[PDB]
Amino acid sequence: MPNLLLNPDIHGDRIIFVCCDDLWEHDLKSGSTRKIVSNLGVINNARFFPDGRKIAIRVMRGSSLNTADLYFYNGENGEIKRITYFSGKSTGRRMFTDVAGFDPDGNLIISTDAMQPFSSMTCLYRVENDGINFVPLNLGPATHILFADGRRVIGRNTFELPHWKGYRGGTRGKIWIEVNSGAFKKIVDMSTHVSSPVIVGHRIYFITDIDGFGQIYSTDLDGKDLRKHTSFTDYYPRHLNTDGRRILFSKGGSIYIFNPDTEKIEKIEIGDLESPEDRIISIPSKFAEDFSPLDGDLIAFVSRGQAFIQDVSGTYVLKVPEPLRIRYVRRGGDTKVAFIHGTREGDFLGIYDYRTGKAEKFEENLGNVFAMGVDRNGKFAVVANDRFEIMTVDLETGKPTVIERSREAMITDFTISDNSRFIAYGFPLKHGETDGYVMQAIHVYDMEGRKIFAATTENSHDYAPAFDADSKNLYYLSYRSLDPSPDRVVLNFSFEVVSKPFVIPLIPGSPNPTKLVPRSMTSEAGEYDLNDMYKRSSPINVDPGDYRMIIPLESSILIYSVPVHGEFAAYYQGAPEKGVLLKYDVKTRKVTEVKNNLTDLRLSADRKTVMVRKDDGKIYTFPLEKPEDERTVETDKRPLVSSIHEEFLQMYDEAWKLARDNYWNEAVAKEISERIYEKYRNLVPLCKTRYDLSNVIVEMQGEYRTSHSYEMGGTFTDKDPFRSGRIACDFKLDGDHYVVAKAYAGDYSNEGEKSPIFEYGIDPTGYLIEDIDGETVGAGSNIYRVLSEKAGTSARIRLSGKGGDKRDLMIDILDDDRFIRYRSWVEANRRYVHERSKGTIGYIHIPDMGMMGLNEFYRLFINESSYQGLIVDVRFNGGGFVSQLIIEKLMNKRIGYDNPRRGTLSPYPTNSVRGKIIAITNEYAGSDGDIFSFSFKKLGLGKLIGTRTWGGVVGITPKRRLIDGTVLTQPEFAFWFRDAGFGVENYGVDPDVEIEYAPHDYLSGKDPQIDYAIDALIEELRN
Amino acid sequence: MPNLLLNPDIHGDRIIFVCCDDLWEHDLKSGSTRKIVSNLGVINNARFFPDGRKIAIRVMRGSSLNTADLYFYNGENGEIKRITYFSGKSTGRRMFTDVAGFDPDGNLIISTDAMQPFSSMTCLYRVENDGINFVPLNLGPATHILFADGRRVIGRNTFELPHWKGYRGGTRGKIWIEVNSGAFKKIVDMSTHVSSPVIVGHRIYFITDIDGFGQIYSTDLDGKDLRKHTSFTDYYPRHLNTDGRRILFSKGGSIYIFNPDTEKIEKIEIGDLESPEDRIISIPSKFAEDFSPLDGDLIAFVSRGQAFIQDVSGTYVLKVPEPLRIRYVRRGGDTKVAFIHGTREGDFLGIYDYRTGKAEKFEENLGNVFAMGVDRNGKFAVVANDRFEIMTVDLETGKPTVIERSREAMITDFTISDNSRFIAYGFPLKHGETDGYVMQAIHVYDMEGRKIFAATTENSHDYAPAFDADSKNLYYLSYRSLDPSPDRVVLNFSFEVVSKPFVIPLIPGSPNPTKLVPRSMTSEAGEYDLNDMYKRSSPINVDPGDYRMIIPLESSILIYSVPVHGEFAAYYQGAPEKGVLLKYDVKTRKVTEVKNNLTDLRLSADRKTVMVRKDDGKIYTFPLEKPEDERTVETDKRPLVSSIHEEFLQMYDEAWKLARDNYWNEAVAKEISERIYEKYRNLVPLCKTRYDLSNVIVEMQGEYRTSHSYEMGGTFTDKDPFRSGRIACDFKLDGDHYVVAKAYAGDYSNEGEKSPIFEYGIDPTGYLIEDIDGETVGAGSNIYRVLSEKAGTSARIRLSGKGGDKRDLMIDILDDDRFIRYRSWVEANRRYVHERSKGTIGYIHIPDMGMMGLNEFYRLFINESSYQGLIVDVRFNGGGFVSQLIIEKLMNKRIGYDNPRRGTLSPYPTNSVRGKIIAITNEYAGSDGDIFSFSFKKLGLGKLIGTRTWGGVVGITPKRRLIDGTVLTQPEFAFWFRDAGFGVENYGVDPDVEIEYAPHDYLSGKDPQIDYAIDALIEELRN
Structure with a gap:
């Protein structure tokens, strides 16, 4: 049982490397290996000091390694010590706040964005008195700093990029060198990304895949005389480090040595080092998903791929007897439950009787299931998959039977009437193939006659169908009540409260029950007729709002309502959406609040029990009759039990399967997937920690050589964040x-x-x-x-x-x-532009294309749009998806004015820029940032200044998490620009005028990009 | 900065030892040292398997290392694995569930009480399939098992005893050896305790201090030819271990080697190994003590020797600027607070103004302070110390002034009137010097006239004095309302509800205010006169109960009441006493509950704010006006910051100081203390973990060579208990x-x-x-x-x-x-005795002399006392203090009978034994168990059978905890038996008839002690 070894460093005959998130040292001379530092959290980098005594260490903390800081290790006394209390933000792809190098004098130089407004601004600092003081080098953003003959060598964005092999975008690692005690010149700027630079003798060695695969190369201190020193073909090499004589690196979980003077390479022998307990305990609530109420006041819930039937107190618990990956569990009868079991081949329907213990499991593959339901009579189930199909599965045999297939999106919103006769579901559709909006109409399937009827028209969004217990009326919701709400800051309006409930009587001639039409005056007593039922549709007299569910009851109707709220917290802090459960009395037509601070709600089969989740993350249960008597569902009374290796294999296979199933190009996915499976699977058994699995999974994700292949969340440690x-x-x-x-x-x-x-x-x-x-x-x-x-x-x-x-x-x-530093920066640049243009030019900055970007854009747009000129700085723009909404504003051409009797002119449109526009971008603006950039040039809004952008334009929409919470993303939506195809991907956007921001620019305290922007507009403003 | 090394083992040139709770291995050949296993919790023992490949490890978990289990370590692959899931109970002195040795075939043999009714019954088990199965050896309780020439060598109670040097009691380590494939013979039974036995060649080497200090000795396999091999004088040697050729051991924090074939001893060189971060973070609530309400709705509280002034939310926090050991904090004024600072020299009064920041600190030593209060006018403070003195300290200068001194106990129950003129306090007293009960009378000190008056008579227990705001009446409580409550099981009665409040008007001729005497009918308007004020005392018309505090308010009186409850939970589980706050309306005389589930209550200076602690351990605060508006006091918003080394020094000094201050013999305490201070203080700087400090502190405690020197509680790990x-x-x-x-x-x-x-x-x-x-x-x-x-x-x-x-x-x-096993055992012995005596003999077992012993004794006593004979088994009796109450029952001589018209005879006394009694005891019965044993013989209640008892009869009453929660105990009360002096201490009680329980007795499944008991009584019953 060998271990996964990585991120090494060398000094003489001693070599330190990482194994099981702990730091190890190995002696070439004796062959002995020992752990020299552990229990600090996950360590991903370690660097020997000049003397080879002290060691700078980067360690991550927080369940998801969301935080990081640096420690010192003195091999002499074995003393450990935290050096930085910056709590730097980090992510797998961008593991910032690290060791940058060492200065001649032996002092540690670190790279960190901790005191900067932008995460990419990883500026260089000289550490002093062990963290007492930090001295800035003012060389601009940098990953590595080396010293050759009194000359500073700067490595920009030179970290490893395992998730994106063959990357050639504008953020690709480059190297600069000092030529005149302040003058810098770029010396290594290849087509591809350059990482892990080191210097042996008078040559710089680095890694790159300019030839198709990762290999070690080198050039002189001028970037001239390129040479290839390795011909690997198994696994990319990574993390180059040296002592000045030999070079160290990791590959396929092993440590290698490269002697430049011999060009000889050899694997260091380490063998087994540590094999921790395979059987682990976990808190079930930590990974809980899917909570459903069963008969007899029992509860079912899924956690970490396992399922359990328990009493609310969590004292009596039954684990479903089924191997890893149960996705869903649903009431199937008195003491039976249906479940969805996922494997590498796909999802399958299963049944389990917790009274008798029996548990059959059908073999018919249903595809990738995203929804599941069982009829009240336990005869059949209804299932939705990613093939956009809705179907019924005979719970007796297992034979699936497709009812209908949408060609736009999944049919996960459905319901079954109590008599098991009809199935109502939302059916996504488009009027045109290239239509920008997907509509959704409710469809009803009649098991008898096996015909599909149209419950509603296809002009908007209809959803949340629900039958009344008697199966006589179909209730549902719609966003059809158009009525605008005004924006309080910008001249704008949107549809916030346009949701309203509607009903449809299944028997023609029957009236809307909530209308309270006297029975003596209505001649009902008809029979089922679903023809043209959308014509009989009728609304229920309830104030428009934002409803997510309607539950028709005897003399009342429950409705789930979500108050209008901002999206910032949910977008950047995972903040859940807060709803409230309302009750509508059919007789008095009066509405009342039944329960607030809700984030999710499920309802019993007999409509008598209500299960919910509140904003505190806890699950509760209360009778529909006495909602005041709710109990808290306890699930952590019993430990969750699992096998590290069984989960790791499971997780790897799932990550690999998702990467294949969701890649935007199916053909490509077929070859890439099959060609990388075994290769990376062989490393899984060497993994013992989550971080280990991450190293393996990300490397296999890089094989798609496309942007947006991330790994977020997950549980890597139990250490509290820094x-x-x-x-x-x-x-x-x-x-x-x-x-x-x-x-x-x-x-x-x-x-x-x-x-x-x-x-x-x-x-x-x-x-x-x-x-x-x-x-x-x-x-x-x-x-x-x-x-x-x-x-x-x-x-x-x-x-x-x-x-x-x-x-x-x-x-x-x-x-x-960070936000305070950011806004300070923005106001500084804004003051600067006003002073340099003598009050003739405005300034706006866009941090990203998400909610924050929308805030900042308008925050300044409303005051900066009416100057003779305008600078739209989108440097460091983190992408997202609102570039189109902003471009629209900047596209507004001013063609009129309003003349008042008193006051000043009003421009038409109000949201138009007055004069010339100039855009500024850099290699740190990407994705939607790439799209905005290309767009600005394409529409001719102005000149684009800066440096080529990131180059990642294949978007994502994740819809699955690994059994441990991990959220993997797959580039699923390739952006195509007319007259450029997919070209922007893996390249970025070239500015009309290229303006490098060299290290000497930072040393002089001058922003060349903004200066040029100003100067250029000034020149354009002379008419 | 060297580390503390201990508990070693050897195999060839490799030597494993413990350092910083982690396991290390050291190679004599290369001099290399490495950590081979960590983060498992605190490891105190590690043993090499025969082959020298696998290693059995004992690790402890639970903040107080209250639990333990065994793990295996395979040095080949570095695999770790838990072997036992017994979660054995352990304590510093008795670290049970360990490696016992290895059998010839290389199999691990463990010692554990996990499946036994008694913790001392650490029986031998052979481990199989790595914990899948356990095979009992049936050799009875044993600590070590060795094998010599196919002969089993048994070591009973042979673990180390650092807390009791020179121990010579009945439970002293002894060695037995097999002589005939089942026949065993005791071969090493010296005057003193023998520990850590090992065999090199054909000799058994062990440790003992028969000569005054710990040295290594050895004898042949017959216990003959004793030899002394070392002459240490610095620190006792401990933990002998061997590989068959050399012997390993620890001493003064270093590892030594002893070569038997050379008689040469040498210190192994290890040097610095690990120096973790000295600055640590802690949760303030975890060590919180003393919580007091200040003006302006502020809170003050002490935690881990630090003090803090904060708002109830814990958002605004101020640390008192004073070095370690603040014992108490009290409101001293608007923005001032008085505190007690403790040092090695003693306690001192200090003042701190949190508004200005100033903080003077008097230098007058107050002794060991246990109570402190400040007058409402911030002029003086009141303080109580262990000299049994009550005094006032001028807050202006610092001059303390003794008011009165009790010669029985501390005067910690006191109060100061609002006008600062009087001081009422409980004054402990005795009528005679050898009186069995200490009475308590309330005394009042008049600052003017400086005279002390008697508020109450000295015939009972008067407490909780409290003045009314106007300073006109003194209220207090008493246990004078004698009224008995019947016992539900035993013919008995006790005073449960005999607490009642009383008042005393300070102006003669003034009536009891709660009597509601019409003002027009009372001619008050007198002046203060405290003479014969105990004659004017009057009760308030409130039902008797168990009151702990009385707070007189304007038109009502608050009273703290404690419902009658059992003592078991509080005695064995630290369960807090639950009280309830009652309100007595003076006008309607109606009582009502204001707040329940309380465990403690404090009241504001202005009597407007109430601060309490509830049974959930949390602190709350509510206005006396609207108790429904309570808030939770948050204290963990800010981390507690401290220095390991500063605390370690502090704690060692405190432990050393307590050991000296509380030792029962002052003269002895003077020499012992001064002679051991420096010696053990030098090891403190080598300690890096709590477990390290424990090794040092306990060893210094052993220097007193007396029983009852324990170390309980404390925080050693943050690992969840097994x-x-x-x-x-x-x-x-x-x-x-x-x-x-x-x-x-x-x-x-x-x-x-x-x-x-x-x-x-x-x-x-x-x-x-x-x-x-x-x-x-x-x-x-x-x-x-x-x-x-x-x-x-x-x-x-x-x-x-x-x-x-x-x-x-x-x-x-x-x-x-355990309890189920215990009672099963008792009912088994009870059935056995009834069958073997043919129904003529009863049986009773007494597990301890605490609450459990009281339960068990009566549980059987009521049914077994009327047989011709009675066996009183007190084997394994854990001691306590109720031996006298049980001996009293056994002392009852039956001298009469009651003849009814219908029914059967009733014996007089009811609680009398009918016939002959026989006592059974062993070396595992101690302390109060020693007392009971000696008593039974001394009073001639019957013959005593078994083996000499423990021998620890110097009792404890701890009243201080270290800053980390640790509770240390000091032998403070030497028991003296008439006609034996203190002799029982360090010796035990010899039985009339000695009946060993050898290993072959256990192999034959026979209890020789109980059989002899039965046989003996049978012989005595022939008259």
């Missing part, structure tokens, strides 16, 4: 005291855009921080750490300014202050 | 199925005395366990582990018996089943 204490200030260790070097502030009147000290009426800039909470900080006391320990609370800070100016305030200590 | 799944059954691996070998049951009708399977109406004995919760158990499936993971819930168990007898039940899986 914390950082922030007050939006920059400290400088001057003498033996810290001085506020800078106090950040954007718009003083906005929320959260300045240092909390401003609230006391003083600008902290220039003051000395005497102490925090009675503890002296300074020369001998790391202010970053002290703040770290007060994050999230208020601490008494003692400040000293000009003269006897002494202050004693209770300061809020933030957990983060 | 769990064990029990169903009160013994499984046997027969073939590839487990069969219930034994199904335990005591009294089927009592609560918790049988296997939960019995509730289904079947005896599981003989059945086969097919599976548990769908999972097959047997040959390839450790049932202990499966159960382990279901503990605390119900699982479906499939059983198979005679023929097609198949059962499927939901069985409760217990977390423990």
Whole structure:
């Protein structure tokens, strides 16, 4: 049982590498191997100091390794010590805040975006007094820094990119070198991405796949005389490191050595190192999914691929006797439950009787199932898959029978009447093949006659069908009640509350039950007739809102309502959507709130029990008769039991299957998938930690050589995330005291855009921080750490300014202050543009193409659009999908004005730019950022300035998580530009005028891109 | 910075030892050292298997290392694996469930009490299939097992005893050896304790301090030819281990080697090994103590020797600027607080102004302070110390001034009137010096006149004084309302509800305010006169109960009441006492409940705010006006910050100081303390973990060579305790199925005395366990582990018996089943005695002298006391303090009878034994068990059978915990027997008839002690 070895470093005969998230050292001389540091969290990088004594270590924390910081290790005494309390943000693809290199004097230089407004701005800092002080190198963003003959060698974006092999976009690793104690020149800028640079002798060695596969290459300190030193074909090599004589690297889970003076390469022998307990325990609620109420007040729920039948208290628990991957569980009868079992071949319907213990499992493959339901009479089930098919599966035999297939999207919204006769479901459709909107009409399938009827017209979005217990009327919801709501900031309107319920009587001549038409006055007593039933449709007198479900009951109707809310929290913090359960009394037509803070709701078969999930993440259950008597469903009384290796294989196969099933190009997916399966599967058995599996899975994802192949979430550690204490200030260790070097502030009147000290009426800039909470900080006391320990609370800070100016305030200590730095940056550039253009040019920045981008764009757009010129800076734009909505605004051509008796002119359109527009972009703007960039040029809105963009334009829409919560993405939607095809993918967008931002530009404190932008517009504004 | 090394083992040139709770291996040949296993919890023992490849490891879990289990380590692949799921109970002094040795075939033999009714019954088991099965050796309790020339060598109680040096009691380690494939003979039984036995060649080497200090000795396999091989004088040697050629051991934190063939000893060189981060973070609530309400709705609380002023939400927090050991914090004024700072020299009064930040700290030593209060006017404080003095400390200067000194106990119950003029306090007293009861009278000190008056008489217990806001009446409580409550089981009565409140008007001629005497009819308007004020005392018309506090308010009186409850939970589970806050309306005289589930209550200076702690451990605060508006006091918003080394030094000094201050003999304490301080202090800086400090502290505690020097609680790890799944059954691996070998049951009708399977109406004995919760158990499936993971819930168990007898039940899986085993044992012995004496002899067992012993004694006493003879088995009796109450019952001599018209004779006394009594005791009965034993003989109640007892009769009453929760105990009360002095200490009690229970007795399944007891009584019963 060998281990997966990676990320090595070397010094003489000693070699340190990572194994099982812990750091190991190996001695070539004796062949001995030992763990020198562990239990710190997941370690992904370790670097020997010059002397080969101390070791800088990067370690990640937070279940999803969402945070990271650096530690020092002194091999002499075996002392460990945290150096940075920045709590840097990191992701698998971008594992920022790391060791950058070492300076001549032996000092550690780190790369971090912790004090920057943008994550890609990983600026270089010289570490001092072990984290007491940080000195900026001002060389701009960089991943590696080397030193050759007194010359600084800069490596930009030179980290590894296993998730995207053959990458050739604008963010591809490049190398620069100093030529004149401040003058820099780019010396390595190949077609492909260059990573892990090192220097042996007077040559720079790096990795690249310019030839189709990862190999080691080198050039002189001028980028001339290229040479290929390896011919690997099994696994890409990674993480080059050296001591000055030999080069170390990992490959296929092993450590290799390359001697430049011999061009000889050899695998170091390590063998078995650690095999932890395979059987692990987990908290079921942590991975719980799908919670459903059963007869007898029992509960069923899925967690980590396992299923369980239990009482609400969680004292009596039964595990479903079925191997890994149960996706869904559903009431199938008195003591029976149907379930969906997933394997590598696909999804299958299964049944389990928890009273007798029997559990058959059909062999008919249903495809990739995303919805499942069983009729109240336990005769058949209804299933939806990714083939866009809706079908019934005979629970007796297993024979699936397709009812209908949509060609637009999945048919997951359906319901079965209580008499098991009809099936109502939302059927996605389009009027045209290239139509921008997908409509949805409700369809009804009659088991007798086996014919499909149209419950509703196809002009909008109809959903949430529900039959009344008697099976006489079909209720459902629609977004057909168009009525606009005004925007409070921008001249705009949208449909916020246009949801309303409707009903359809299954017997013609029968009226809408909620209309309360006297029975004596209605001559019903007809028979079922679903023909032209959409004509008999009728609404129910309920105020329009945003409804997600309607449950018709005897003398009332329950409705799930979602109040209008912003999308920022849900978009960047996974914040769940808060709903409330309403009750509509049919007789009094009065509405009332039955339960709030809801995030999900399920209803019993007999409509008597209600199961819900609230905003606190907990699951509750209450009788529909007495909602005041709810109980909390306990699931953690019993540990979840599993096998690391069984899960790892399962997860790898699923990741591999998703990558294949969702790749935008099917043909390509066929070859790529089959050609990489076994290769990466062979490494799975060597994995013992989640991080190990990640290394393997991401590498197999890179085989698609396409953008947007990510791995998010998941449980890699149980260590609490690193914390950082922030007050939006920059400290400088001057003498033996810290001085506020800078106090950040954007718009003083906005929320959260300045240092909390401003609230006391003083600008902290220039003051000395005497102490925090009675503890002296300074020369001998790391202010970053002290703040770290007060994050999230208020601490008494003692400040000293000009003269006897002494202050004693209770300061809020933030957990983060990125946004404050960001807005400060924006206002700075905005002030700068106004001053340099003498008040003739506006400025707007767009951070991403998501919700934040929409905020920032309008936040400044409403005040900067009426200058003679306008600069639209989209540098560092993280993408998303709203580029089209913004482009639309910038496309508005001003063609008129409004002349008032009093006041000033009003432009028409209101949302139009007044004059010339100029766009600024860089290699850090990508995806929707790529699309916006290409678009701006394509529509001729103005000139595009900067550097070629990222080049990743194949979008994603994940719809599955691994059994551990992990969310993998697959490039499923290839963007095609008219007159460019898919070309932007793996290339990016070239600016009309290329303006590099070299390292010497940063040293001079000048932004060449913005200056050119200003100068250019000024030149254009002379008419 | 060297580390503390301990508990080593050797095999060739490799040597494994423990450092920082982790396991290390060291190679003598290369001098290399490495950590081979970590993050498992605290490891205290590791043993090499025969081949020198696998390693058996004992690891502890639970914050207080309250649990333990064994693991295997395969150095070949580096595989780790849990072997036992017994979750054995352990304590520092008794670290049970360990490796016992290895058999010739290379099989591991363990010692454990996990399946026994008594913790001392650490029986020997041979491990099989890595924990799948355990085979009993039936050699009785044993710590070590060795093999010499096919002969089994047994070591009883041979573990180390660092907390009791020079121990010579009945439980001292002894060695036995086999002489005839079943016949055993005791061969090493010295005056002192023998530990860590090993065999090199044909000699047994062990440790002992027969000469005054720990040294290594050896004898031949007959116990003859004793030899001393070392002459240490610095630190006792410990943990002997060998490979057959050399002997390994630890001393003063270093590893040594002893070569028997040379008699040469040398320290192995290891040097620095690991120095973790000194600065640690802690959860404040985990170590919180003392919570007090301040002005402005602020809160003050002490935690881990630190103090803090915060708002109830815990968002605004101030740490008091004072070095380690703040014991108490109290409101001193608007924005001032008084505190008690403790150092090695003693306790000091200090003041801190949290508004200005100033914080003076007086230098006058107050002694060991146990109570502190400040007057409402911030002029002076009141303090109580262990010198039994009550005093006032001028908060302006610091000059303490003793008011009065008690010669019985501390004066910690006091109060100060609102006008700061009087001080009322409980004054402990005795009528005679040798009086068995300490009385308590309330005393009042008048600052003007400086005279002390008697508020109450000295005939009982008066407490909880409280002045009314106007300072006109003194309220207090008393246990003077004698009224008996009947016992439901035994003919007995006790005072349960005899607490009643009383008041005393400070102005003679003024009536009891709660009597509602019309003002017009009372001619008050007098002046203060405290003379003979105890004569004017008056009660308030409130039903008697168990009151702990009285708070007089304007038109009502608050009273804290504690419902009558059992003591078992509080005695063995630390369960807190539940109280309720009552309100007594002075006008209507009606009482009502204001708040329940309380465990503690504090009241504001202005009597407007109430702060409480509830049974959930959380702290709450509510206005006295609207108790429905309580808020939870949050304290964990901010991490607690400290330094390992500063705390370790602090804790060691405190432990050392307590050991000196509380030792029963002052003279002795003077010499012992000063002679050991530096010696053990030098090891503290080598400690990096709590377990490290424990090794050092306990060793310094052993220097007192007295019993009852323990170390309990504390936080050693953050690992969850080991769990064990029990169903009160013994499984046997027969073939590839487990069969219930034994199904335990005591009294089927009592609560918790049988296997939960019995509730289904079947005896599981003989059945086969097919599976548990769908999972097959047997040959390839450790049932202990499966159960382990279901503990605390119900699982479906499939059983198979005679023929097609198949059962499927939901069985409760217990977390423990010791009590069930215990009662089963007792009922077995009880049945046995009845059958062997032909129904002429009764039987009773006493497990301890605490609450459990009281239960068990009466549980059988009421049915076994009227036989011709009676056996009182007190074997394994854990001690406590109720021996005197039990001896009293056994002392009752029957001298009469009651003759009824109908029915049978009633004996007088009812609680008398009818005939001859016989006591049984062993070396596992100690302390109060020693006392009971000595007593039985001394009073001539009957003959005493068995083996000499433990020998620890110097009692404890701890009253301080270390800053981490640790509870240390000091032998403070030397028991003196008339005509024996303190002799029993470190010796025990010799039985009239010695009856060894040798290893071959256990092999024959016979209890020689009980048989002799029966036979003896039978012989005595022939008259």
